[PDB]
């Protein structure tokens, strides 16, 4: 009902409509069948203003969808640097891992999101985290052939 509308409004980037629905009692942490909350969808679609509103309105910054992905996972994968920073500003788990051990740093590293990898590292991202198949973010950058990124993630000892 109101939660459904709030999900679509966050997905569509309708900042005004998000505020209306919250004012009318929409559950800021409503979740669809896949477990996405409005903050998931806003981070995925890149709607920084809505992310801000949702967080001021009590959104769960560390909500997990059914795959273990948090809004920071989605912002990292989609390359939404501003949203990554805002989430981290609001206590997002920088080393949160999805169901196979994948952290946001892995997802940022996948797409060569250079500035995001740097922000994640600035906020305590652990370069030594491996997913279930032993892949660090540095390993991913090597596998994808991303030279500049490897130097930033490189461990020396």
């Amino acid at each position: 009902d109101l939660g459904k509308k709030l999900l679509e409004a966050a997905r569509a980037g309708q900042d005004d409509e998000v505020r209306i629905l919250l004012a009318n009692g929409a559950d800021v942490n409503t979740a669809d069948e896949t477990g996405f909350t409005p903050l998931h969808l806003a981070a995925w679609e890149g709607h920084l203003g809505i992310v801000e509103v949702l967080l001021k309105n009590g959104a769960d910054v560390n909500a997990n969808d059914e795959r273990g992905h948090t809004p920071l996972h989605l912002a990292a994968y989609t390359g939404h640097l501003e949203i990554v920073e805002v989430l981290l500003k609001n206590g997002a788990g920088v080393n949160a891992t999805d169901v196979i051990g994948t952290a946001p740093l892995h997802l940022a590293a996948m797409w060569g999101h250079l500035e995001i990898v740097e922000v994640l590292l600035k906020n305590g991202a652990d370069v030594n985290i491996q997913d279930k198949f032993g892949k660090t973010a540095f390993d991913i950058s090597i596998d994808n052939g991303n030279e500049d990124l490897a130097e930033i993630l490189q461990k020396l000892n």
Binding site: T34, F36, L41, L74, V99, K132, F133, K135, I140
Partner: peptide, 16 residues
């Protein structure tokens, strides 16, 4: 593994 991510049809891979 193919791991779906996001509300669409996207997926990342690691290993199998």
């Amino acid at each position: 593994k193919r791991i779906h991510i996001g509300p669409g049809r996207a997926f990342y891979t690691t290993x199998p």
